[PDB]
Amino acid sequence: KYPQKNAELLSAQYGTNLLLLGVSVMLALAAPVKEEHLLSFITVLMLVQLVWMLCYMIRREGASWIRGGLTMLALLSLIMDAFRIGSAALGVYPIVHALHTISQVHFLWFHIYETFERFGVIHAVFTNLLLWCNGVMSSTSLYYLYPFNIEYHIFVSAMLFVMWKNIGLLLGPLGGLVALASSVSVLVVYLIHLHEAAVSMFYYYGVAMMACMCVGSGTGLLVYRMERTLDTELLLASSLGSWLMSWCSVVASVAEAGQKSPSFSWTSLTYSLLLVLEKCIQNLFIVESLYRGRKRQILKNICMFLFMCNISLWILPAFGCRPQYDNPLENETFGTSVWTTVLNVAIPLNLFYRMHSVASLFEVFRK
Amino acid sequence: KYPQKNAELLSAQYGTNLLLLGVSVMLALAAPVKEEHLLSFITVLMLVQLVWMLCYMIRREGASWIRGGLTMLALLSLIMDAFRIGSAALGVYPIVHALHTISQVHFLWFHIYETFERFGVIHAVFTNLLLWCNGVMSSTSLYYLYPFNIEYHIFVSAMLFVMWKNIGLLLGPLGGLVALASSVSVLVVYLIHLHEAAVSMFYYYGVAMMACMCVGSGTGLLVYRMERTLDTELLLASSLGSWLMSWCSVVASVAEAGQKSPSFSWTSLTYSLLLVLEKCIQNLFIVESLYRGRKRQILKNICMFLFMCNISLWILPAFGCRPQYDNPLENETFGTSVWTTVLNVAIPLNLFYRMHSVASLFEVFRK
Ligand SMILES: CC(C)CCC[C@@H](C)[C@H]1CC[C@H]2[C@@H]3CC=C4C[C@@H](OC(=O)CCC(=O)O)CC[C@]4(C)[C@H]3CC[C@]12C
Ligand SMILES: CC(C)CCC[C@@H](C)[C@H]1CC[C@H]2[C@@H]3CC=C4C[C@@H](OC(=O)CCC(=O)O)CC[C@]4(C)[C@H]3CC[C@]12C
Ligand SMILES: CC(C)CCC[C@@H](C)[C@H]1CC[C@H]2[C@@H]3CC=C4C[C@@H](OC(=O)CCC(=O)O)CC[C@]4(C)[C@H]3CC[C@]12C
Ligand SMILES: CC(C)CCC[C@@H](C)[C@H]1CC[C@H]2[C@@H]3CC=C4C[C@@H](OC(=O)CCC(=O)O)CC[C@]4(C)[C@H]3CC[C@]12C
Ligand SMILES: CC(C)CCC[C@@H](C)[C@H]1CC[C@H]2[C@@H]3CC=C4C[C@@H](O)CC[C@]4(C)[C@H]3CC[C@]12C
Ligand SMILES: CC(C)CCC[C@@H](C)[C@H]1CC[C@H]2[C@@H]3CC=C4C[C@@H](O)CC[C@]4(C)[C@H]3CC[C@]12C
Ligand SMILES: Oc1ccc(-c2nnc3n2Cc2ccccc2OC3)cc1
Ligand SMILES: Oc1ccc(-c2nnc3n2Cc2ccccc2OC3)cc1
Ligand SMILES: Oc1ccc(-c2nnc3n2Cc2ccccc2OC3)cc1
Ligand SMILES: Oc1ccc(-c2nnc3n2Cc2ccccc2OC3)cc1
Ligand SMILES: Oc1ccc(-c2nnc3n2Cc2ccccc2OC3)cc1
Ligand SMILES: Oc1ccc(-c2nnc3n2Cc2ccccc2OC3)cc1
Secondary structure (H helix, E strand, O other): OOOHHHHHHHHHHHHHHHHHHHHHHHHHHHOOOOHHHHHHHHHHHHHHHHHHHHHHHHHHOOOHHHHHHHHHHHHHHHHHHHHHHOOHHHHHHHHHHHHHHHHHHHHHHHOOOOHHHHHHHHHHHHHHHHHHHHHHHOOOHHHHHHHHHHHHHHHHHHHHHHHHHHOOOOHHHHHHHHHHHHHHHHHHHHHHOOOHHHHHHHHHHHHHHHHHHHHHHHHHHHHHHHOOHHHHHHHHHHHHHHHHHHHHHHHHHHHHHOOOOOOOOHHHOHHHHHHHHHHHHHHHHHHHHHOOOHHHHHHHHHHHHHHHHHHHHHHHHHOOOOHHHHOOOHHHHOHHHHHHHHHHHHHHHHHHHHHHHHHHHHHHHHO | OOOHHHHHHHHHHHHHHHHHHHHHHHHHHHOOOOHHHHHHHHHHHHHHHHHHHHHHHHHHOOOHHHHHHHHHHHHHHHHHHHHHHOOHHHHHHHHHHHHHHHHHHHHHHHOOOOHHHHHHHHHHHHHHHHHHHHHHHOOOHHHHHHHHHHHHHHHHHHHHHHHHHHOOOOHHHHHHHHHHHHHHHHHHHHHHOOOHHHHHHHHHHHHHHHHHHHHHHHHHHHHHHHOOHHHHHHHHHHHHHHHHHHHHHHHHHHHHHOOOOOOOOHHHOHHHHHHHHHHHHHHHHHHHHHOOOHHHHHHHHHHHHHHHHHHHHHHHHHOOOOHHHHOOOHHHHOHHHHHHHHHHHHHHHHHHHHHHHHHHHHHHHHO
């Protein structure tokens, strides 16, 4: 029996104080508070969300890219758990976590207003946000699945928040197929030699692709000039992670350049600035396309090229080719813990952004 | 000659990469990058904003609470600068900063669309946000003015962002006057003895006032139940700082309680939880009032009481009574650098929130 304005503010205050409590626990942990205390806290929050989901289901009883999105990242998370399962907080957390993931997908697939529902969904938003934060701050198969569990817990947090926020074609695919074959070659050569040559190859390949995407998107923008809020916000919020990764690399490269060090190399400076520029241009192209016969064929070739390039760029870190963690300079300017966390944020965000863009470019291409 | 959607996204991307660059510099500094490099970076950004403001002015040539808000906090900032003025980056920064503050107030008072204006205002938003972040991370008069320069640089950042986001009465004043006289007594007694007794007095006084405000706001909510977006967002965003301060204190108090330490005291646990509860209740009361004869007199007495209590609570940290920095427990669980930064965020946010609430309660009272 609350006014809607009070139901929304009270739910927001509950959720934000839940986040700030998680923040307090994480700060206390890094500085009395042990890993078991943070795991126990989030485990309890998952148990609370599970109780809400069960009660909700009892009371109740072109999105294929999004449903297949979280179903794949949840299956990958369940695989990760299965590996971890096979202190009390460490022993219990993966069980509650697996149940949380299973119920979270079941609910979002089939059961996606009262104050009960608003508190439930806000709780879920900040539970998944805290799960992201924990995945980022805290056998060998757990390495490759790491970005997929983290992007699972940022995707689902967005999926839950935005739910209530609302409430001829020749050159394109040829360039795309070449970029994909080259990306696969870079991926396998890098993994086989897991060395320095493969890293340099990776960065030169990256620069070449980022420059080609800048040209493609710029051409599309010129065509539009001479002649959906959530998609823009999701592209920008996700790309911010990669823009921090890039600015950290740029700052470290400039700091090295200022000393006239013999180790300075343009491949760690031009690439990061190019990543920021290309993403700014692509974000503007994609949103312009979403707010909209030679021009049609040109735009289709551009979207097909960018689509394929974004898939190839998603593929690189998605399959284990993440050399940024081993950078000899960024791990000295910021240290290993800061560089590692910045990448732990940026990489799963970069995977999200590179598959978001692929879905938006696909839609633009079809129409 | 940009579409409005592209003008807004491109400006947002410029501003956010400006923030992420400032983030990169601050991380690099804490971990190659010295204080002079961060001061130089922000000094240059202030010079850029000054150039924009001059070009803009050349091209061009119930808000009294807000205009008097930033005019007072800018005069206090100029006083702080005057004290600092009387490495090259340290010598130059206060001059550019003073000019920035003077032009920022001149512009906001008298000169508060083209892409030029959008890039200019977004730059100013993230320049002031970076200035806040620097004031928080990095004679004796500089102590007392510290929260006012920091809240200046968070107030003005909000003032600039929201600009474009938009584009009978017996018991009340008697309780208020008693709360004010008691707050002044606590303030002067604390400062005179600048000791442990004054701190305990402060915390017991705080708890007594927070409980009285909870009763007042709860009564007002009951009256409304038995019978403006930016204001809600500013109250919540500002109160978040105090909710982090409170949860850090609560976590430290619980960690101490879990060890059965003889030093555990309820005054550091009940107060922080009460601060969170009272603010949640008051935020819901104020927004309910903004979205709206015995009931009228009751509501006027409640608003008058809360108005006076929020002034008294603003007065306590505003005049130097900030004992939270000396807490013997929160500075051990989180360390001195983390507890100090959490308070450097929360206190100027608490001052903002406690004068925001006073302006909203004043408006509600008059009508
Ligand atoms: C962007 C929104 C949605 C918030 C999500 C991220 C937060 C949960 C992040 C932001 C800043 C993070 C903190 C930033 C700073 C620190 C201090 C740092 O402390 C040290 O490592 C100090 C080491 C020493 O000197 O002993 C460790 C990480 C920690 C606790 C981080 C934990 C998680 C925080 C609160
Ligand atoms: C919301 C946007 C517009 C603001 C930009 C900043 C945020 C996106 C924050 C939230 C998550 C933060 C990161 C999360 C955690 C850390 C941990 C911290 O590293 C450590 O945990 C250990 C410190 C050490 O011992 O070196 C360094 C800061 C960093 C990378 C933070 C950098 C700033 C981030 C990206
Ligand atoms: C909320 C939005 C609007 C962003 C505004 C705040 C950011 C500018 C904050 C968020 C997290 C902050 C960082 C969090 C973590 C660190 C790591 C910390 O590093 C250490 O102290 C490690 C010490 C050591 O182990 O040697 C110092 C502060 C710093 C750089 C902070 C600098 C400023 C950051 C990026
Ligand atoms: C946007 C909301 C909903 C997310 C909640 C977190 C944010 C509000 C961030 C931005 C500013 C952050 C703070 C800014 C800086 C620091 C510095 C850091 O302390 C240090 O600088 C030194 C670390 C050490 O050596 O102990 C500890 C984290 C803390 C308090 C951060 C805690 C989390 C805050 C409040
Ligand atoms: C559209 C699909 C691909 C979505 C994401 C699924 C990902 C996580 C799957 C796809 C195929 C998998 C890879 C194929 C085989 C190898 C070689 C081995 O030595 C290390 C693991 C590794 C490298 C696997 C890791 C996980 C993997 C990358
Ligand atoms: C509405 C007004 C008050 C807005 C804010 C102005 C503030 C910053 C002004 C008001 C009066 C001032 C105080 C009055 C006198 C003293 C005693 C001296 O030993 C330390 C400084 C100190 C404690 C001053 C600090 C700054 C001050 C707190
Ligand atoms: O056949 C597939 C299906 C999905 C993915 C995938 N994996 N992660 C993500 N998606 C999809 C997605 C959809 C919308 C917005 C963002 C986003 O990014 C997350 C991969 C292969
Ligand atoms: O990989 C990503 C990263 C960020 C977003 C995103 N973009 N806008 C929003 N989020 C997420 C979010 C989550 C919890 C609370 C607030 C909040 O803010 C809304 C999406 C995908
Ligand atoms: O450099 C970055 C920048 C942003 C993130 C990030 N990822 N998810 C979230 N943010 C913060 C954010 C930014 C805009 C809107 C909402 C929101 O909240 C959730 C990470 C690294
Ligand atoms: O006579 C005065 C006038 C202003 C202040 C003051 N000082 N700081 C702040 N204000 C005012 C204010 C107004 C609207 C929203 C927030 C807010 O908070 C900032 C004090 C005495
Ligand atoms: O003391 C405060 C603290 C926060 C707010 C506030 N509330 N909502 C917003 N801000 C400020 C802001 C500043 C820069 C970029 C984005 C942004 O987000 C909007 C106000 C007063
Ligand atoms: O515990 C806290 C929580 C928040 C802040 C803070 N202060 N100013 C800003 N935030 C972050 C924020 C939160 C909501 C909307 C915008 C926004 O951005 C600016 C500080 C301490």
